[PDB]
Amino acid sequence: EFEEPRVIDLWDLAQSANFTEKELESFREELKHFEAKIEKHNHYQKQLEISHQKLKHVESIGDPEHISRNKEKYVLLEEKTKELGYKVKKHLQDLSSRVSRARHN
Amino acid sequence: XNXXX
Amino acid sequence: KEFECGSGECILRAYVCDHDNDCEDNSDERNCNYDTCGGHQFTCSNGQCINQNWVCDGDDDCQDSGDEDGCESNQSHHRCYPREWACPGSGRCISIDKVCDGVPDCPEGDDENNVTSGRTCGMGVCSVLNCEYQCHQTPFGGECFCPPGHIINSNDSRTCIDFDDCQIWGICDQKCENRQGRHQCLCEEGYILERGQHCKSSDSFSAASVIFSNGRDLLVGDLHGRNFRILAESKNRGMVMGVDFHYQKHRVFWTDPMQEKVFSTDINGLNTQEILNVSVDTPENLAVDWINNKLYLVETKVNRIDVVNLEGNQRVTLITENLGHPRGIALDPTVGYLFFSDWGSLSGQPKVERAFMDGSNRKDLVTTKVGWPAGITLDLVSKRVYWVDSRYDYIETVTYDGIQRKTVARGGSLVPHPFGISLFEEHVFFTDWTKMAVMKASKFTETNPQVYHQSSLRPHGVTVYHALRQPNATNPCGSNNGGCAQVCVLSHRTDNGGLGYRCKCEFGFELDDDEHRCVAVKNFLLFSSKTAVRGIPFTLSTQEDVMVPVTGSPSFFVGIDFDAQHSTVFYSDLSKDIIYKQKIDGTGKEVITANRLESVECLTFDWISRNLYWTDGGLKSVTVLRLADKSRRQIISNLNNPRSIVVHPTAGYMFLSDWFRPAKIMRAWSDGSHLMPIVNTSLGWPNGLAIDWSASRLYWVDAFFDKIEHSTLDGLDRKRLGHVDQMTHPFGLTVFKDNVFITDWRLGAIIRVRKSDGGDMTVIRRGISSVMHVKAYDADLQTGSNYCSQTTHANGDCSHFCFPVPNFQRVCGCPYGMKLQRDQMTCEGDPAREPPTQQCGSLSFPCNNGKCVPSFFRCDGVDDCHDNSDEHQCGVFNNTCSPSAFACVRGGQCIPGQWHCDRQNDCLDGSDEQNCPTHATSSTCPSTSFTCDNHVCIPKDWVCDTDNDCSDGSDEKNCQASGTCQPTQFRCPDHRCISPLYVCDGDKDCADGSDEAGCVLNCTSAQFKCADGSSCINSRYRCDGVYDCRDNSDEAGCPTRPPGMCHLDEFQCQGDGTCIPNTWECDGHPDCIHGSDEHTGCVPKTCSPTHFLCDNGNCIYKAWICDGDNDCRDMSDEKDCPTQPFHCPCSQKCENVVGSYICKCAPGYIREPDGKSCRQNSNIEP
Amino acid sequence: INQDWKCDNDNDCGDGSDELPTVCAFHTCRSTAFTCGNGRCVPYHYRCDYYNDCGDNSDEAGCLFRNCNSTTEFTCSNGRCIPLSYVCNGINNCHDNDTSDEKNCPPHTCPPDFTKCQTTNICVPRAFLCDGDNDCGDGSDENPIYCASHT
Ligand SMILES: *[C@@H]1O[C@H](CO)[C@@H](O[C@@H]2O[C@H](CO)[C@@H](O[C@@H]3O[C@H](CO[C@H]4O[C@H](CO)[C@@H](O)[C@H](O)[C@@H]4O)[C@@H](O)[C@H](O[C@H]4O[C@H](CO)[C@@H](O)[C@H](O)[C@@H]4O)[C@@H]3O)[C@H](O)[C@H]2NC(C)=O)[C@H](O)[C@H]1NC(C)=O
Ligand SMILES: *[C@@H]1O[C@H](CO)[C@@H](O[C@@H]2O[C@H](CO)[C@@H](O[C@@H]3O[C@H](CO)[C@@H](O)[C@H](O)[C@@H]3O)[C@H](O)[C@H]2NC(C)=O)[C@H](O)[C@H]1NC(C)=O
Ligand SMILES: *[C@@H]1O[C@H](CO)[C@@H](O)[C@H](O[C@@H]2O[C@H](CO)[C@@H](O)[C@H](O)[C@H]2NC(C)=O)[C@H]1NC(C)=O
Ligand SMILES: *[C@@H]1O[C@H](CO)[C@@H](O)[C@H](O[C@@H]2O[C@H](CO)[C@@H](O)[C@H](O)[C@H]2NC(C)=O)[C@H]1NC(C)=O
Ligand SMILES: *[C@@H]1O[C@H](CO)[C@@H](O)[C@H](O)[C@H]1NC(C)=O
Ligand SMILES: *[C@@H]1O[C@H](CO)[C@@H](O)[C@H](O)[C@H]1NC(C)=O
Ligand SMILES: *[C@@H]1O[C@H](CO)[C@@H](O)[C@H](O)[C@H]1NC(C)=O
Ligand SMILES: *[C@@H]1O[C@H](CO)[C@@H](O)[C@H](O)[C@H]1NC(C)=O
Ligand SMILES: *[C@H]1O[C@H](CO)[C@H](O)[C@H](O)[C@H]1NC(C)=O
Ligand SMILES: *[C@H]1O[C@H](CO)[C@H](O)[C@H](O)[C@H]1NC(C)=O
Ligand SMILES: *[C@H]1O[C@H](CO)[C@H](O)[C@H](O)[C@H]1NC(C)=O
Ligand SMILES: *[C@H]1O[C@H](CO)[C@H](O)[C@H](O)[C@H]1NC(C)=O
Ligand SMILES: *[C@H]1O[C@H](CO)[C@H](O)[C@H](O)[C@H]1NC(C)=O
Ligand SMILES: *[C@H]1O[C@H](CO)[C@H](O)[C@H](O)[C@H]1NC(C)=O
Ligand SMILES: *[C@H]1O[C@H](CO)[C@H](O)[C@H](O)[C@H]1NC(C)=O
Ligand SMILES: [Ca+2]
Ligand SMILES: [Ca+2]
Ligand SMILES: [Ca+2]
Ligand SMILES: [Ca+2]
Ligand SMILES: [Ca+2]
Ligand SMILES: [Ca+2]
Ligand SMILES: [Ca+2]
Ligand SMILES: [Ca+2]
Ligand SMILES: [Ca+2]
Ligand SMILES: [Ca+2]
Ligand SMILES: [Ca+2]
Ligand SMILES: [Ca+2]
Ligand SMILES: [Ca+2]
Ligand SMILES: [Ca+2]
Ligand SMILES: [Ca+2]
Ligand SMILES: [Ca+2]
């Protein structure tokens, strides 16, 4: 039960690792949360350029209120995608490193 | 050397 | 549609209540509830559970920094508490009642007048700063201050802001609450508030007492130190190292590393009894599990953390992986955690770490500035853990999650070498090896720890004996043993789905699929070592020993084999020259034989006929012994260097390897006849043999050519495995399933490769001191039968010996001194050819077990026979004592001379210490050295180093912080003074690493510098095949042979291109596959007329011919003349021979078997 | 003859020359062969095989044979377990030395060309009579009741 290209190889690399059946069983339930972070990040990754074009379209209109309102939503939206960016990366590094060490010996 | 000693 | 957000949005279903602000009005997570965090997770104040490893990894994980809340101590982020001020000269804060009170309180005088820097304790600033509440004097001027519960605002320094009084370290013992209603202290059940801020034990509990080890004996004393009772004195020169106690059963448990045993006694005395006496060679520490009545203990010979019952049974090994030097241990059964300290790990770093009480989830609790953690105690009510350091000389505290790190005592002048630690109420009780005393110190901040029972030895253990020290709880394993078949071990309360326990299995069994029923284990990897013989699982998922390790103080184990029928393990101890057998769980150990052994290289066990074989490198022979009756026969003799022996019962052959200069692998019948070479070419140093039972092939390792080969049992179809990466000196090997488990001497590790071509080498265990043999324990392969094990009649009708023979036959044999009769099945005594022999020579005492030692070893106070036969009944009936011993005045006992006047009372009547004159001679200590008050000379550089080099504490006396280091010493900043030899030694001795700061390496020409410049290695390790350097720079750029050729120093085989040393060309023996190294152009060799010429080309004296010794080393001088009576006195380059011609390929080409064609050896297509 | 065949209680030569006593009164057996009380050799796998190969029955002496129940045994003296309806079926199969497999059932008889050797129930095919081999189990294969001169 996986779709992300990053997660798929991790599960494949997990089945060749040192993981005990209980460790392997708990490993899957962590990848499920890891994908949810990615799909949340991916969803906002679209929303950044959608609102970026929305911000650009409004700036061409020239209304100071709509420009200010969209910008206020925009910068907070950038924080949302930026903050989720590291959380995905941090979780990716730990998961990749753990299977790297489990396959190291 | 190969001696076990 | 979807989840309509608080302001009308189609928020996805899984976004709500994911610990994230998703709704635009911050309302997407209010109406639900979350999960709680399991024992392996950290709750980050928002309900978000994160991995325990993410706590203080240096990275904020909860946009609150809740998991990095100051896990480094003594930092720059002071922001000091109310009524405090910072003197600019250092990272220190001092309360206002001290600041400018007239006395220097920052040690540098930075809180009093310093005219040299133009600073005075002024007050004029208040006149214009206009303080909101109050003012005080500082070296800056009048400083504004505000009452407790509030701190000076940092924008202006004139206003003051509401502050949490509960956040100051030590505001109240245990816990405090009521922020709005001013700070107030709460004391839990059994505790009452006295004087305020001081929790005190309830009167309903018995008087608190401190039990501790003064260095040799267990002592007991009350908190105030008014009385001191000796609870248990040590016997047989013992030593009480680590103590602990159970309150409900009122028992005290302590470990005696010297006697090598664990003891338990009642608190009032009496009922003293041993708890463990096997495989506890060094029980460093101890901790009881009062809730489940278990006894966790730390063992350091074979590094592990075991679990036993309070009476010693049901041993289970919990944590073994990566343990290098476990020293401290503590646990909290209420929540389920287990804490232990490791002052050196195999990876290199020392660590204080947390785990469940079954070792499920290990987490490095403290890693930075950890040095040598030596003892762990924990505040069971505030949820904190206290540990000490002997190297950086501090006592420090972190939460159960390791978040809030705080220091309570530090500095070499305060805690030079703490070992143990315990706490009660508000005082931490720790023992120190340098001040040689138990010490009392406040649990929050101690400026000068008070003394408590100063001792004359190293105090090794301390713990507080009180009821409140062991809280009151319900064990999950109390419900019919938790359903576990054998052992029920606790865990974290949230583990196992909330049960709070897991079932464990004893040594001889394994846990089934239902993790409830224990079944007998069938296979595990058995390997020996210089230190111990250990059995480990074949899979690397769990690295916990499956059998209890076999160990001894004097020990060198080399040969091993197993008997799966009775679950016993045979082994040989090269230091005692005794062959033992021991059960898997360690219960029953006896000796197989101990007579006439010199160096038993390898054992092997014929599981069907029950005959134990072993090679003897000293006697140069192999011996077979039967177990049912101790018949013994030396079947093969006159070898040169026999190392490895493997016996094949069903097939009938025994296989053997000799690594002398004409090395060969020989095979013979189990009888010992038909001894013929099986592999005697292209071979040198065949250190080990193994049989692939699934395919009937014989594997062996070569330590000279650094290769693994295999062949059929006839020596034909010989194939060579692929190149193994770092195998440079293999010793032993075994074959189990698809993999071969090779042991390496130089690596000191067990490596695993595939039996097909080698392939994916995986290291099983690194760091073995001297690994020696490996063996695959397997109950499946120890089955089957032949004519030696028919059910209808006894052992093949042979009386003493029956041996399997190829083509499924059998032959009989007879012991030494006994001859097979005409029936070929029954034996009779033959005193004519094999007359009786005594246990051993004259200048030796025959011991009971079969050993015998040089006579003068009789009655010298040392057990040399290893069964106390030579020390039995000394000093009576002219059964006298050796000069090397000390005789007791009334007789009946003799002790080693080192025990005479040694300050220990060894002899029963005390004669060994009575009338002992002093040694206060007229002697000088060298002026380059320092004189200990014990009158032992130490280098003058070892003074005030916080180490007790004098063993009396003289060198560290008067070493207060007010002082210098000697001109030949380096100063650690407010830590200690060290010898310059520790400056750029490689490791940080300083608390802040000032000894290793920014200096560069001076590697000599006898050494090689790695490319990364990290470290140097000896020139011998340059270009050897092992990556000594971290970046593998030592092996980069190393010389190689030309493709298909050999170095100028070597010689190339014509048949198959094998490279052999140049000396092996023209040395009489065909070291090549087709005799290429003994061609017709070989100049022969002769010897002197007074010398005989052996078949292999050696020269031996005229009188030495047939003298009875293997002078020729190939038996030529003995086999030749037996007349000794009874008396009482071409495609390539060609070479010409007499009529034929010899076709020689050029180097890099190999000859085809037809004898004319040559083939290029390089795989490069032309 | 092969040297393995010398004095092994089997007339390999067909005339007793290989079983000649005055050579195995001195000849010793091969370490890999069982030895009888009389000194004659025998392959080891004949030990405890329900056959009297040694002659003195020493190759069957002291063997802890298996117990079995009446559905597959009548307690043939050698210890064999032989199935029901195979006892007293008309042919010896447990090879008892007194042929006790069949003789335990007295009152039976069979048509001709299957000779009732003696009074016992067995009825061996007539082709075995006067073939040169005594294989009825009883005496009536070559003893003077036939094959004397009427052949
Ligand atoms: C963990 O759980 C256990 C079980 O609940 C607790 O054990 C009890 O602890 C209390 C607190 O001390 C004990 O109460 C004391 O009992 C004493 C006598 O009991 C002993 O002797 C009787 C037989 O006579 C036994 O049955 C019993 O097991 C004990 O061995 C009294 O002498 C004490 O009172 C005395 O002092 C008070 C002042 O403090 C005076 O006012 C009285 O007059 C009197 O002189 C006291 O009542 C109780 O006995 C314990 N029971 C057991 C079975 O051990 C642990 O305390 C608990 N741990 C914690 C911290 O909760
Ligand atoms: C190293 O091993 C080889 C092979 O075992 C030894 O060479 C000789 O090999 C032959 C088998 O090929 C052995 O048996 C001989 O066979 C021939 C037929 O080919 C037969 O006619 C002979 O009567 C004999 O049975 C021979 O025994 C073996 N030699 C020995 C001494 O074992 C070679 O000798 C070995 N190296 C050394 C140093 O002996
Ligand atoms: C270990 O300790 C237990 C007690 O818990 C003890 O029973 C074991 O065996 C005893 O050892 C004594 C010393 O070797 C021995 O004298 C005594 O007979 C023996 N008792 C029995 C009946 O087993 C102890 N083992 C060892 C080897 O110390
Ligand atoms: C030495 O060792 C033996 C035990 O093997 C010990 O019994 C001997 O003591 C006694 O010596 C006596 C001679 O003075 C002798 O008569 C006696 O039998 C013997 N033992 C007994 C039963 O007391 C020790 N000394 C000697 C000399 O052997
Ligand atoms: C003043 O100090 C407070 C903290 O007490 C801080 O939050 C604030 O940003 C500062 N600035 C002003 C002018 O409020
Ligand atoms: C040793 O290495 C040091 C590094 O500082 C260097 O300065 C010096 O020249 C080298 N030679 C010696 C032996 O001092
Ligand atoms: C008897 O026959 C029965 C089967 O009907 C069998 O169970 C049993 O083992 C046999 N033997 C004995 C000794 O009873
Ligand atoms: C076994 O049968 C033989 C005939 O082959 C017979 O001579 C012998 O007497 C029998 N054994 C006994 C004990 O009767
Ligand atoms: C919180 O959830 C964990 C999940 O393993 C456990 O169920 C735990 O018991 C829960 N919290 C409490 C206090 O019961
Ligand atoms: C005597 O030595 C012979 C070998 O020479 C045997 O090893 C025999 O077992 C020895 N006898 C005793 C009593 O140990
Ligand atoms: C006793 O005998 C032993 C063995 O011969 C030693 O010689 C020892 O020195 C003797 N000591 C005395 C006191 O006679
Ligand atoms: C003890 O003996 C030594 C022997 O050299 C000295 O005589 C020393 O003075 C003695 N000690 C005392 C206290 O007299
Ligand atoms: C090793 O040395 C040879 C020359 O003897 C070649 O330089 C060869 O390329 C070297 N080895 C490798 C793997 O490059
Ligand atoms: C071999 O060397 C010995 C050395 O003593 C003799 O010189 C002998 O004569 C030599 N043999 C030949 C054939 O020269
Ligand atoms: C006995 O005969 C066997 C088989 O022929 C062997 O020849 C053996 O050498 C003979 N002698 C002995 C003592 O067994
Ligand atoms: Ca959310
Ligand atoms: Ca973190
Ligand atoms: Ca002051
Ligand atoms: Ca120190
Ligand atoms: Ca080598
Ligand atoms: Ca001795
Ligand atoms: Ca003494
Ligand atoms: Ca010192
Ligand atoms: Ca250093
Ligand atoms: Ca190297
Ligand atoms: Ca040679
Ligand atoms: Ca000789
Ligand atoms: Ca015959
Ligand atoms: Ca038979
Ligand atoms: Ca029948
Ligand atoms: Ca017939």
UniProtKB/TrEMBL annotation, chain D:
<comment type="similarity">
    <text>Belongs to the LDLR family.</text>
</comment>
<feature type="disulfide bond">
    <location>
        <begin position="29"/>
        <end position="41"/>
    </location>
</feature>
<feature type="disulfide bond">
    <location>
        <begin position="76"/>
        <end position="94"/>
    </location>
</feature>
<feature type="disulfide bond">
    <location>
        <begin position="36"/>
        <end position="54"/>
    </location>
</feature>
<protein>
    <recommendedName>
        <fullName>Low-density lipoprotein receptor-related protein 2</fullName>
    </recommendedName>
</protein>
<feature type="disulfide bond">
    <location>
        <begin position="48"/>
        <end position="63"/>
    </location>
</feature>
